[PDB]
Amino acid sequence: KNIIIGAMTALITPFKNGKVDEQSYARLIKRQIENGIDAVVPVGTTGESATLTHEEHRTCIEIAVETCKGTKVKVLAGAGSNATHEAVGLAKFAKEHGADGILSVAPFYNKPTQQGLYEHYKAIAQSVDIPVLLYNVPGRTGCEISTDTIIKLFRDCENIYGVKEASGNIDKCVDLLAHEPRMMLISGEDAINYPILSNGGKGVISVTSNLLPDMISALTHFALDENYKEAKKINDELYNINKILFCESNPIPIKTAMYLAGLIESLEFRLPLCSPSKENFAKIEEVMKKYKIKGF
Amino acid sequence: KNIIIGAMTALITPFKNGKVDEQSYARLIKRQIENGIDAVVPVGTTGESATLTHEEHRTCIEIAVETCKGTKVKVLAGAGSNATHEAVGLAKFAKEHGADGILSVAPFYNKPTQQGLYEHYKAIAQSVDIPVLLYNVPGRTGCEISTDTIIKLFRDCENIYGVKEASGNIDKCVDLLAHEPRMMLISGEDAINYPILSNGGKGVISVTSNLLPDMISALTHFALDENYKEAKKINDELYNINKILFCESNPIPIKTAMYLAGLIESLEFRLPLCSPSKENFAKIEEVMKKYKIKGF
Amino acid sequence: KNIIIGAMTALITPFKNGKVDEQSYARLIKRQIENGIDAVVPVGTTGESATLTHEEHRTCIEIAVETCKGTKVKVLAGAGSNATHEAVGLAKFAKEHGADGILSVAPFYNKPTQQGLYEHYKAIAQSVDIPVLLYNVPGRTGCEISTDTIIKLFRDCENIYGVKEASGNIDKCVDLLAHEPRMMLISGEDAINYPILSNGGKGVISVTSNLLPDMISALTHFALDENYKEAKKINDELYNINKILFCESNPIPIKTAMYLAGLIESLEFRLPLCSPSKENFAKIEEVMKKYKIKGF
Amino acid sequence: KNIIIGAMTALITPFKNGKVDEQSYARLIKRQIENGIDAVVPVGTTGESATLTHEEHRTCIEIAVETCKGTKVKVLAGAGSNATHEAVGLAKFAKEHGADGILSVAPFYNKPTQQGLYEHYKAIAQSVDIPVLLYNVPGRTGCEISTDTIIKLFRDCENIYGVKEASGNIDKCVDLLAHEPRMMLISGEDAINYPILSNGGKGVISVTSNLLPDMISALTHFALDENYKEAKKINDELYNINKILFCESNPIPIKTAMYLAGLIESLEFRLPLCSPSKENFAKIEEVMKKYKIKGF
Ligand SMILES: [Mg+2]
Ligand SMILES: [Mg+2]
Q: Which cystines does this chain contain (chains A, B, C, D)?
């Protein structure tokens, strides 16, 4: 199977005067490349995919594809939806635009069954011939992709190569890699990046890496090289920022942190997302003081 | 405040050959009207709102509005989204089409904070001049509209007149009506229709009423007339079907039941929703046999 | 079946200088009787059963039995355990000491299966010839008595006449009384006292009644007399104190309130129970303010 | 600090004719010693502590101490309670009987606060001069020992040296060892033995090791020697038996498995524990077929 693994960043989407700040976006992606990131994830959850228009969806993928050309950095585009017909369209959309692969979140709100999840992803995988990474995050979607369903999709659809787990469930990560050790388990939960990698996970799709890409990059590759003491030390070091970056719903804290570090121009969200509380704004500001944040 | 209360039905959306069975849709609404229902809710969760096109959304609202024209039956149209700018558009859209009001689900997946939920619904309420009913279903959305946020929105916005609760939390229903007794609490969970009504709830948005509209309407009206013994008696009789209609994710069982009862011609869903398992197919069929199902 | 229903109080156990204040205990029980209570529950959870000696267990049961002589108030003694042989011993112990019935909590910590729970209660029920009330509180025990197991015990065991439910699950309360309407459902959660009674529950085992016995008694008796409007008015008025009495684990807040109202002499617990935070002490004091607290 | 770490077994307590089979108990302990186990845990949860008499508690402890004399195997005695005064007595009781340390479960059922948990364990730690390992298992106790409380207890009481975690929460295990790397994190969940060890945990208190002590011992010591690839291979292979051993509440499955392998004579529990269902009996028998089970 063709795969996209290693240290990866779920890109935030900076807004300026309510529109996508394109200059910014490209500059942020180049900053990721220059700090050892292996792939970037445009218009994912952290990029506020829910509140972007389809044309802004096209714009950010194209910018990501164009910025990583000539580099080893891959573009893993967010291309999921809770209606299979649209998810297939967004996948073909993502491929047509040069994405190296797609991250396709489990259908949200409408709670498909495991049989439905299988047919959903089976349709997406047969739509394009680029790698497909499943994304399981039940706290947001209301559904869970079972280990059996993930394994069946991995074995039945050739371009489905793994799953990004955001479920706080190291039991499930043992289950997945013990029964199907060929799949690429991807950490979608920054605080537990190292434990997932230490059990055979092959990368992270990180929120923290927006702010500290060099540290998330070093952690991942230490782990992939089985230097577990070095990876665990960074994982331990980063725990405080990993937790405070979810003081409020992601991506509210990470965008607040990026603004505090002068990496984005304005702290703008699209409703129903909003700026954090003032207590949290200060809490985020206090944790950042203990880390070294790379510039441009 | 202008309100829409009483026995209400979250209408299923029948498909035939992948298209909205428009004639069936109209016939199903007439069956609701003739069995004492007070309002119908087109293109809600039970209507597979997530997988309908915006023009199919329009068609079902228009069919619902005209089918109830000349009757007292009201149309509470589904018009929610997790992107505020889209939720405002669907609200004005629903008004334009003749809806008496809108049911607006809490933003799903992107987990807005309480501040964001407040701004989300305040933008929606200021979009139109028709009643707005909040819809709290945390198991689907990943977020909760707190009691304080519901009460604040009720007091600040003219058209926000209550909440449809589907959270299995009778405590919160006491919290809501004890601190704001003027609001319209609406049951969105058929099994506990009577306990919510007996505490001062003023209606139901029902899944079971698709199959048994006369039973759900009588239950609601017994309750509103303070004949709690008769409303509880129907609620107790309905428990078995109320539960089995969620053996799998709603609306997979209710559509199965409508097809088994010969009320729709084909048991078609739009992916990622699919037919139920064969064991649950048998369970729905067996529970249905103990209830009298009205024809057309 | 012989039953013990109505307004009932889970009695706190006052300590003075590390010993049971037996005269304060007596004063408290007499205060309960004179405010319309139908039964008292000595050495339950609210009475810190876990940290009392078996000899102090006897003292409090006997004091309760002696204090209720000449009145209609029954003694439903706490006599449960997670070891079946001990729970049977405590049951015979309770009868031998004059209790009218026993409240028997579901085995805690060791998580028996449904088959094990049935055999547990079947052994207890055959040990004595006084009424036995099941107590389901999964947040404390780690186990749940399923509706089927409760029903089986009610139908198979003569002294098992109902269940005290403290599970925040109004669905289960419908489930129970719809399939076995002859059983006595007793609310063990003060905040949802009225909805449980309105669904056919026949009493409450209350924490709040320690502080506000007249209000809990009136609520219950209005409800039993089918005066649902008055029962709901009291339930809504009590919501604030009903919630704050669980700001920390019961009985920490209720004892703090009993001390604040001058009803007990010392704010003493037995470890691992301790005084509340200084903020929760403050909140309890504020909330307490809004209610008229009967003296002796 | 003096510590007890490595591969450890939560010993089952075999019964024959309702009596502790003391002679099988000794035979089972010697089997653990001879298969590389570093410490044994008498009268814990897996040992059905709740249903043993205090005289059987002392008897099983003395057998454990006597069998491990002249060997490197330590006895970490179960000596916990939800009443601090009894837990202090049980601690003294354990020292008196020769135990090398105690495993002391968080108070169950009565849900003490963090402040109460602190004073509870501080009294126990100051009760004796032998190592104390905290035991956090919220699914059984109803309470959680927070990271802050564990850390405070570790720093303030010299004989408290770590915590056995049974909470399925790899985030918390990162939290613990990132903020206090000197403590001994011990796995209390067999399926995730490797991830806990790979993050710096120094041992396991295992259920599976009852049946496969050689495999659990090799797992732990591959891990302690940083041969993580070999430790992960054993963990992955044990996953199926690790999960099936909790098909029903522990220790019902492990005793069923021990009985199926001919390692104990009678499939006897003390109520409320009981034999498993016949479907789970068949499931346990089927998963066992894939492992080499060492005899006597
Ligand atoms: Mg290298
Ligand atoms: Mg192996």
A: none
